[PDB]
Design a binder for this molecule. Structure first.
Ligand SMILES: CNC(=O)C[C@@H](Cc1ccc(Cl)c(Cl)c1)NC(=O)CN1C(=O)[C@@H](NC(=O)C[C@@H](N)Cc2ccc(Br)cc2)CCc2ccccc21
Ligand code: NA
Length: 149
């Protein structure tokens, strides 16, 4: 599953970068996936600030403390797409919520849960929106969508 592995590499690098504050080559996505990661930082940081009250509100109701709680986040995550809407905006909102959870996990000393978090975000994304992701040419479509001239 190449789409899974490539999506996981980008999502996982972004969530740990966000959690630690430390930003080397993407062995699978290459110079292109570097552009995907750079695009994720720029648009994902704008999304996080914009939905901060909503993210804080979600985190409060969830009470995420350990890996078990993190694995139960999958039931919540599918609802980023449950209104029948699929677009890159929604996809970045899901990843930014992951980066928001990843920072919280690093704060409460649960850094080990960041990788299973990246995996459950990638699983929800790739297993439920595979056809749409393939129609959009995966991360190529994402880079093109948010491209600034
Ligand atoms: C079991 N259901 C839930 O836990 C409800 C969750 C769903 C959810 C939203 C986003 C993500 Cl990143 C995930 Cl991981 C799960 N939402 C909320 O807690 C509050 N929240 C909402 O209410 C949003 N609207 C929705 O959630 C209705 C969805 N069915 C479809 C949908 C999803 C995302 C957007 Br943006 C717009 C529409 C509007 C405002 C907002 C901005 C950012 C984050 C959350 C919200
Ligand atoms: Na484990």
């Amino acid at each position: 599953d190449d789409l899974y592995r490539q999506s996981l590499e980008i999502i996982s690098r972004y969530l740990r970068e966000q959690a630690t504050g430390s930003k080397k080559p993407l062995g699978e996505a290459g110079a292109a996936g570097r552009r995907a990661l750079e695009t994720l930082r720029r648009v994902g940081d704008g999304v996080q600030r914009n939905h901060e009250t909503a993210f804080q509100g979600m985190l409060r109701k969830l009470d995420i403390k350990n890996e078990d709680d993190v694995k139960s986040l999958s039931r919540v995550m599918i609802h980023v797409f449950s209104d029948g809407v699929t677009n890159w905006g929604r996809i970045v909102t899901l990843i930014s919520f992951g980066a928001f959870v990843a920072k919280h996990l690093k704060t409460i000393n649960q850094e080990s849960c960041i990788e299973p978090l990246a995996e459950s975000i990638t699983d929800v994304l790739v297993r439920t929106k595979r056809d749409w992701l393939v129609k959009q040419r995966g991360w190529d479509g994402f880079v093109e969508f948010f491209h600034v001239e």
